[PDB]
Amino acid sequence: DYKFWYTQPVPKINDEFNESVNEPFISDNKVEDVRKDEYKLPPGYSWYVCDVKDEKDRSEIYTLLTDNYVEDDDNIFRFNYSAEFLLWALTSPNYLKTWHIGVKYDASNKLIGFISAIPTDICIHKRTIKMAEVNFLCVHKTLRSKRLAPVLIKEITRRINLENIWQAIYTAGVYLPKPVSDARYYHRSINVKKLIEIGFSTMSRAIKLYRVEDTLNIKNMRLMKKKDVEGVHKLLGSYLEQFNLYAVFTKEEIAHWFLPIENVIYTYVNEENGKIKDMISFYSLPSQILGNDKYSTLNAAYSFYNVTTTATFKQLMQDAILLAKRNNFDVFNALEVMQNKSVFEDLKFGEGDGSLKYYLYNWKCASFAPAHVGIVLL
Ligand SMILES: CCCCCCCCCCCCCC(=O)SCCNC(=O)CCNC(=O)[C@H](O)C(C)(C)COP(=O)(O)OP(=O)(O)OC[C@H]1O[C@@H](n2cnc3c(N)ncnc32)[C@H](O)[C@@H]1OP(=O)(O)O
Ligand SMILES: CNCCCN(C)c1ncc(F)c(N2CC(C(=O)NCc3cnc4ccccn34)C2)n1
C-alpha cells in the first residue's frame, strides 16, 4: 500500500518511464507556498535543531545511531558511525544547520529520532539539479512502527523546500517506490580468520586463497594533501560526467570529501611531478559486533571514488584492497556501480546478501543498471 509514500511525488511501484523523460513530478513550486510552521509531533515529543559542531548535540546523535541504526538481517552487527565521521558527513560546504533535525522524548529529554540532509548538485541524465542528500534517518528501537518516520521526512522536506530546493537523492537497503537504480554489494575478505570467527563470512587454505598481494601496481600512491585538490577536482570531475547519476563537485567540495581524516576517509593519489593521474578513496564505517566475547568492532572499508589513467581498473582496485589492508581493515566493501562490477570476480570479491537502492525524490526518469551510477552515499 505504501500509505505514506503513496502521497509523495515519487514514481509508483510498477512505473516505467521512456528514455526521453527527465523532469520533476511536481514543478513550478513556490517557496511562499511551503508550510511555515513545523509539523505537529505527537504529545510528549519535541523538535530539536541539532548543532553537529556542538559536542553535546553530536554526542547525542552518535549515541542514538550507535544504539538504534541499521542492523543486519540476523542482528549480528550494527553500524557504528564515529562522531568524527558524522561531523564530516554533515558539515559539507554550504550545509544548513536547520537540515539536521532531531526529535526528543520529553519525559526523558533524550533524542529518539533524527534525519539529515546536505545540499549537493546532482546530475541526473545529464541535467544538473540542486538537491538535498538525505541520510541518517533513525528512530529509537522502542518507538518503531509508531509512524514517526513519515513526520521526520515531511518536516525535513519542508525545511529543504524553504530553501527553494525541490529534489532529493537518498539510498536505502529496503525497497521503496521506486529505485532509479539498484546495486548489490560485494565483499573482499582481508582478515579471513576474523570474518569467519564473527560470522561475517579449509581454514588454512582460505587464508592462502584470499591473501592480498603485498605490492601495489601503482607505485607512487600517497595520501592526498591539500595541494592536490585542483588535480583531484580535474581528475574526478571529468571522470564522473560519463554516468547517468553523479554529483558535480566544486573545488571546496573536493577538499571536504576527499582530504584524509583518520578512521573516516582515506584518499590516495598518484602525483607524478604535480599531476594527479590516479586516485583511490574509501571511507571507514565500523560495525559494532553485538554480544561477542573476543571482538567488539568489525573494521570495514567502503569503496568511495577510484579513478585511473595510468593503469587498468582491476589494478587500481587491487591497490585499493591492499591500501585498506595496510590500514588494518578487515573487509573491503564495494557496490556494483561505475566500473566496479568488472573487477569483482578476478579480485575474489564475494557476493553480498542484499542490494542498495538509489532513489530520487520528485524526479521522473527512466531507471538504469547500476554500472551507470557514479555516486556513492555515506
Ligand atoms: C525535496 C526534499 C525531499 C527530502 C526527503 C527525501 C526522502 C527521504 C526518505 C528517507 C531517506 C532515508 C535514507 C536513510 O537514512 S537509509 C537509513 C535507514 N535507517 C535505518 O534503517 C535505521 C534503523 N531503522 C530505523 O531507525 C527505523 O526502522 C526507520 C526510521 C528506518 C523506519 O521507521 P519505523 O520502522 O518506525 O517506521 P514508521 O512506522 O515510523 O514509518 C513507516 C513508513 O516508513 C517507511 N520507511 C521504512 N524504512 C524506510 C527508509 N529506510 N527510508 C524511507 N522510508 C522508510 C515505510 O515504507 C513506511 O511507509 P509506507 O510503507 O507506510 O509508505
Ligand atoms: C554505508 N551506508 C549505510 C546505510 C546504507 N546501507 C544499508 C548500506 N550502504 C552500503 C553498503 F555497502 C551496505 N552494505 C554492505 C553490506 C554489509 O556490510 N553487510 C553486513 C553488515 C555488517 N554490519 C552491518 C550493519 C548493518 C547491516 C549489515 N551489516 C550492507 N549497506
PDB file of C-alpha atoms in Angstrom, residues 162-323:
ATOM      1  CA  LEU A 162      12.029  26.531   2.258  1.00  0.00           C
ATOM      2  CA  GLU A 163      15.477  26.801   0.612  1.00  0.00           C
ATOM      3  CA  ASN A 164      13.923  26.688  -2.900  1.00  0.00           C
ATOM      4  CA  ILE A 165      15.129  23.082  -3.304  1.00  0.00           C
ATOM      5  CA  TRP A 166      12.588  20.549  -4.565  1.00  0.00           C
ATOM      6  CA  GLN A 167      14.566  17.378  -5.374  1.00  0.00           C
ATOM      7  CA  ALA A 168      16.467  14.915  -3.216  1.00  0.00           C
ATOM      8  CA  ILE A 169      18.652  11.830  -3.505  1.00  0.00           C
ATOM      9  CA  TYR A 170      18.845   9.002  -0.994  1.00  0.00           C
ATOM     10  CA  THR A 171      19.810   5.350  -0.686  1.00  0.00           C
ATOM     11  CA  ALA A 172      18.296   2.549   1.368  1.00  0.00           C
ATOM     12  CA  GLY A 173      18.567  -1.213   1.623  1.00  0.00           C
ATOM     13  CA  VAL A 174      14.790  -1.597   1.709  1.00  0.00           C
ATOM     14  CA  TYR A 175      12.670  -1.483  -1.442  1.00  0.00           C
ATOM     15  CA  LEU A 176      10.674   1.758  -1.630  1.00  0.00           C
ATOM     16  CA  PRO A 177       8.844   3.415  -4.554  1.00  0.00           C
ATOM     17  CA  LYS A 178      10.805   3.497  -6.703  1.00  0.00           C
ATOM     18  CA  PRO A 179      14.544   2.888  -7.208  1.00  0.00           C
ATOM     19  CA  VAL A 180      16.143   4.779 -10.066  1.00  0.00           C
ATOM     20  CA  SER A 181      18.886   2.142  -9.773  1.00  0.00           C
ATOM     21  CA  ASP A 182      19.733  -0.911  -7.680  1.00  0.00           C
ATOM     22  CA  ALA A 183      23.267  -2.018  -6.789  1.00  0.00           C
ATOM     23  CA  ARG A 184      24.267  -5.196  -4.991  1.00  0.00           C
ATOM     24  CA  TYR A 185      27.289  -5.038  -2.708  1.00  0.00           C
ATOM     25  CA  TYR A 186      30.352  -7.282  -2.690  1.00  0.00           C
ATOM     26  CA  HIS A 187      32.961  -8.045  -0.045  1.00  0.00           C
ATOM     27  CA  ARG A 188      36.716  -8.566  -0.382  1.00  0.00           C
ATOM     28  CA  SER A 189      37.980 -10.505   2.622  1.00  0.00           C
ATOM     29  CA  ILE A 190      41.192  -9.254   4.227  1.00  0.00           C
ATOM     30  CA  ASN A 191      41.383 -10.663   7.765  1.00  0.00           C
ATOM     31  CA  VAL A 192      39.960 -14.074   6.893  1.00  0.00           C
ATOM     32  CA  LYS A 193      40.295 -15.604  10.367  1.00  0.00           C
ATOM     33  CA  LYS A 194      38.298 -12.777  11.950  1.00  0.00           C
ATOM     34  CA  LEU A 195      35.482 -12.743   9.382  1.00  0.00           C
ATOM     35  CA  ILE A 196      34.684 -16.414   9.998  1.00  0.00           C
ATOM     36  CA  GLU A 197      35.214 -16.025  13.757  1.00  0.00           C
ATOM     37  CA  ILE A 198      32.497 -13.334  13.912  1.00  0.00           C
ATOM     38  CA  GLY A 199      30.130 -14.987  11.438  1.00  0.00           C
ATOM     39  CA  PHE A 200      30.573 -12.371   8.715  1.00  0.00           C
ATOM     40  CA  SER A 201      31.666 -14.950   6.127  1.00  0.00           C
ATOM     41  CA  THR A 202      39.658 -25.345   4.722  1.00  0.00           C
ATOM     42  CA  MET A 203      40.798 -22.674   7.178  1.00  0.00           C
ATOM     43  CA  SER A 204      44.488 -22.636   6.239  1.00  0.00           C
ATOM     44  CA  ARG A 205      43.754 -22.899   2.509  1.00  0.00           C
ATOM     45  CA  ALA A 206      41.289 -19.998   2.718  1.00  0.00           C
ATOM     46  CA  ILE A 207      43.897 -17.815   4.438  1.00  0.00           C
ATOM     47  CA  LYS A 208      46.149 -18.564   1.463  1.00  0.00           C
ATOM     48  CA  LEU A 209      43.446 -18.404  -1.228  1.00  0.00           C
ATOM     49  CA  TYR A 210      42.229 -14.908  -0.276  1.00  0.00           C
ATOM     50  CA  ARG A 211      45.665 -13.479   0.514  1.00  0.00           C
ATOM     51  CA  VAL A 212      46.326  -9.887  -0.554  1.00  0.00           C
ATOM     52  CA  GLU A 213      49.432  -9.397  -2.692  1.00  0.00           C
ATOM     53  CA  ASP A 214      51.742  -7.114  -0.729  1.00  0.00           C
ATOM     54  CA  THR A 215      52.792  -4.867  -3.639  1.00  0.00           C
ATOM     55  CA  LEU A 216      50.949  -2.012  -5.324  1.00  0.00           C
ATOM     56  CA  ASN A 217      50.556  -1.848  -9.091  1.00  0.00           C
ATOM     57  CA  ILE A 218      50.695   1.968  -8.924  1.00  0.00           C
ATOM     58  CA  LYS A 219      53.939   2.605  -7.059  1.00  0.00           C
ATOM     59  CA  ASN A 220      53.556   6.349  -6.427  1.00  0.00           C
ATOM     60  CA  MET A 221      50.323   6.265  -4.367  1.00  0.00           C
ATOM     61  CA  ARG A 222      50.490   8.576  -1.345  1.00  0.00           C
ATOM     62  CA  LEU A 223      47.908  10.099   0.973  1.00  0.00           C
ATOM     63  CA  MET A 224      46.163  13.115  -0.522  1.00  0.00           C
ATOM     64  CA  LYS A 225      47.310  16.552   0.639  1.00  0.00           C
ATOM     65  CA  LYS A 226      45.615  19.904   0.200  1.00  0.00           C
ATOM     66  CA  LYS A 227      47.820  20.974  -2.723  1.00  0.00           C
ATOM     67  CA  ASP A 228      46.324  18.028  -4.661  1.00  0.00           C
ATOM     68  CA  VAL A 229      42.775  19.458  -4.586  1.00  0.00           C
ATOM     69  CA  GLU A 230      42.873  21.010  -8.063  1.00  0.00           C
ATOM     70  CA  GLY A 231      44.278  17.848  -9.640  1.00  0.00           C
ATOM     71  CA  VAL A 232      41.745  15.617  -7.892  1.00  0.00           C
ATOM     72  CA  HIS A 233      38.992  18.059  -8.886  1.00  0.00           C
ATOM     73  CA  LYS A 234      40.105  17.799 -12.525  1.00  0.00           C
ATOM     74  CA  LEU A 235      40.618  14.025 -12.441  1.00  0.00           C
ATOM     75  CA  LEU A 236      37.393  13.064 -10.664  1.00  0.00           C
ATOM     76  CA  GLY A 237      35.307  15.834 -12.221  1.00  0.00           C
ATOM     77  CA  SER A 238      35.891  14.757 -15.814  1.00  0.00           C
ATOM     78  CA  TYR A 239      35.606  11.059 -14.921  1.00  0.00           C
ATOM     79  CA  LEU A 240      32.151  11.385 -13.350  1.00  0.00           C
ATOM     80  CA  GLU A 241      30.491  13.068 -16.361  1.00  0.00           C
ATOM     81  CA  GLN A 242      30.203   9.692 -18.136  1.00  0.00           C
ATOM     82  CA  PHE A 243      27.490   8.431 -15.763  1.00  0.00           C
ATOM     83  CA  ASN A 244      23.715   8.776 -15.565  1.00  0.00           C
ATOM     84  CA  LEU A 245      23.848   9.922 -11.922  1.00  0.00           C
ATOM     85  CA  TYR A 246      26.678  11.775 -10.184  1.00  0.00           C
ATOM     86  CA  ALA A 247      27.429  14.798  -8.021  1.00  0.00           C
ATOM     87  CA  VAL A 248      29.041  17.901  -9.524  1.00  0.00           C
ATOM     88  CA  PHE A 249      31.890  18.790  -7.163  1.00  0.00           C
ATOM     89  CA  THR A 250      33.380  22.200  -6.585  1.00  0.00           C
ATOM     90  CA  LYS A 251      36.999  22.521  -5.500  1.00  0.00           C
ATOM     91  CA  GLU A 252      35.715  23.240  -1.993  1.00  0.00           C
ATOM     92  CA  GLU A 253      33.651  20.041  -2.039  1.00  0.00           C
ATOM     93  CA  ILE A 254      36.679  18.120  -3.345  1.00  0.00           C
ATOM     94  CA  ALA A 255      38.701  19.302  -0.341  1.00  0.00           C
ATOM     95  CA  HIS A 256      35.984  18.419   2.174  1.00  0.00           C
ATOM     96  CA  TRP A 257      35.053  14.994   0.821  1.00  0.00           C
ATOM     97  CA  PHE A 258      38.498  13.585  -0.004  1.00  0.00           C
ATOM     98  CA  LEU A 259      41.241  15.103   2.163  1.00  0.00           C
ATOM     99  CA  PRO A 260      42.235  12.362   4.629  1.00  0.00           C
ATOM    100  CA  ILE A 261      40.717  12.057   8.090  1.00  0.00           C
ATOM    101  CA  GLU A 262      41.971   9.159  10.200  1.00  0.00           C
ATOM    102  CA  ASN A 263      39.361   6.418  10.753  1.00  0.00           C
ATOM    103  CA  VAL A 264      36.981   8.374   8.496  1.00  0.00           C
ATOM    104  CA  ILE A 265      38.069   8.914   4.886  1.00  0.00           C
ATOM    105  CA  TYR A 266      41.229   7.727   3.108  1.00  0.00           C
ATOM    106  CA  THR A 267      42.232   9.134  -0.284  1.00  0.00           C
ATOM    107  CA  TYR A 268      45.442   8.089  -2.031  1.00  0.00           C
ATOM    108  CA  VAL A 269      46.744   9.817  -5.167  1.00  0.00           C
ATOM    109  CA  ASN A 270      49.372   9.113  -7.828  1.00  0.00           C
ATOM    110  CA  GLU A 271      51.084  12.512  -8.038  1.00  0.00           C
ATOM    111  CA  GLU A 272      53.745  12.449 -10.769  1.00  0.00           C
ATOM    112  CA  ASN A 273      55.588  15.796 -10.742  1.00  0.00           C
ATOM    113  CA  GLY A 274      52.461  17.600  -9.536  1.00  0.00           C
ATOM    114  CA  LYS A 275      49.956  15.915 -11.879  1.00  0.00           C
ATOM    115  CA  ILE A 276      47.176  13.883 -10.254  1.00  0.00           C
ATOM    116  CA  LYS A 277      46.717  10.898 -12.575  1.00  0.00           C
ATOM    117  CA  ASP A 278      45.167   8.206 -10.336  1.00  0.00           C
ATOM    118  CA  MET A 279      43.138   8.277  -7.134  1.00  0.00           C
ATOM    119  CA  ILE A 280      41.934   5.709  -4.603  1.00  0.00           C
ATOM    120  CA  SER A 281      39.400   6.568  -1.907  1.00  0.00           C
ATOM    121  CA  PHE A 282      37.438   4.629   0.701  1.00  0.00           C
ATOM    122  CA  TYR A 283      35.748   5.570   3.959  1.00  0.00           C
ATOM    123  CA  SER A 284      35.721   3.847   7.340  1.00  0.00           C
ATOM    124  CA  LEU A 285      32.424   2.552   8.761  1.00  0.00           C
ATOM    125  CA  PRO A 286      32.975   0.070  11.599  1.00  0.00           C
ATOM    126  CA  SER A 287      30.166  -2.210  12.738  1.00  0.00           C
ATOM    127  CA  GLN A 288      29.557  -2.971  16.399  1.00  0.00           C
ATOM    128  CA  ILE A 289      29.644  -6.737  16.941  1.00  0.00           C
ATOM    129  CA  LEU A 290      26.682  -7.445  19.216  1.00  0.00           C
ATOM    130  CA  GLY A 291      27.318  -9.940  22.007  1.00  0.00           C
ATOM    131  CA  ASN A 292      30.716 -11.346  21.027  1.00  0.00           C
ATOM    132  CA  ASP A 293      33.356 -12.414  23.533  1.00  0.00           C
ATOM    133  CA  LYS A 294      36.533 -11.813  21.522  1.00  0.00           C
ATOM    134  CA  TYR A 295      35.813  -8.893  19.186  1.00  0.00           C
ATOM    135  CA  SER A 296      33.859  -5.663  19.642  1.00  0.00           C
ATOM    136  CA  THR A 297      34.293  -3.819  16.325  1.00  0.00           C
ATOM    137  CA  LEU A 298      34.463  -5.001  12.719  1.00  0.00           C
ATOM    138  CA  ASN A 299      36.670  -2.544  10.823  1.00  0.00           C
ATOM    139  CA  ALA A 300      35.149  -2.263   7.343  1.00  0.00           C
ATOM    140  CA  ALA A 301      36.368  -0.114   4.457  1.00  0.00           C
ATOM    141  CA  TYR A 302      33.840   1.119   1.892  1.00  0.00           C
ATOM    142  CA  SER A 303      34.904   1.892  -1.678  1.00  0.00           C
ATOM    143  CA  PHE A 304      34.354   5.574  -2.450  1.00  0.00           C
ATOM    144  CA  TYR A 305      35.754   7.027  -5.713  1.00  0.00           C
ATOM    145  CA  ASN A 306      38.578   5.418  -7.697  1.00  0.00           C
ATOM    146  CA  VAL A 307      39.865   6.831 -10.997  1.00  0.00           C
ATOM    147  CA  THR A 308      42.835   5.579 -13.004  1.00  0.00           C
ATOM    148  CA  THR A 309      44.573   6.806 -16.152  1.00  0.00           C
ATOM    149  CA  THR A 310      47.993   5.094 -15.931  1.00  0.00           C
ATOM    150  CA  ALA A 311      46.684   1.572 -15.245  1.00  0.00           C
ATOM    151  CA  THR A 312      43.695  -0.719 -15.629  1.00  0.00           C
ATOM    152  CA  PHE A 313      40.731  -0.526 -13.277  1.00  0.00           C
ATOM    153  CA  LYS A 314      41.413  -4.036 -11.955  1.00  0.00           C
ATOM    154  CA  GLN A 315      44.924  -2.921 -10.988  1.00  0.00           C
ATOM    155  CA  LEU A 316      43.519   0.250  -9.413  1.00  0.00           C
ATOM    156  CA  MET A 317      41.014  -1.676  -7.289  1.00  0.00           C
ATOM    157  CA  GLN A 318      43.707  -4.234  -6.463  1.00  0.00           C
ATOM    158  CA  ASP A 319      45.796  -1.467  -4.887  1.00  0.00           C
ATOM    159  CA  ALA A 320      42.694  -0.194  -3.072  1.00  0.00           C
ATOM    160  CA  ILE A 321      42.289  -3.508  -1.241  1.00  0.00           C
ATOM    161  CA  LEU A 322      45.973  -3.587  -0.281  1.00  0.00           C
ATOM    162  CA  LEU A 323      45.843   0.029   0.908  1.00  0.00           C
TER     163      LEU A 323
END
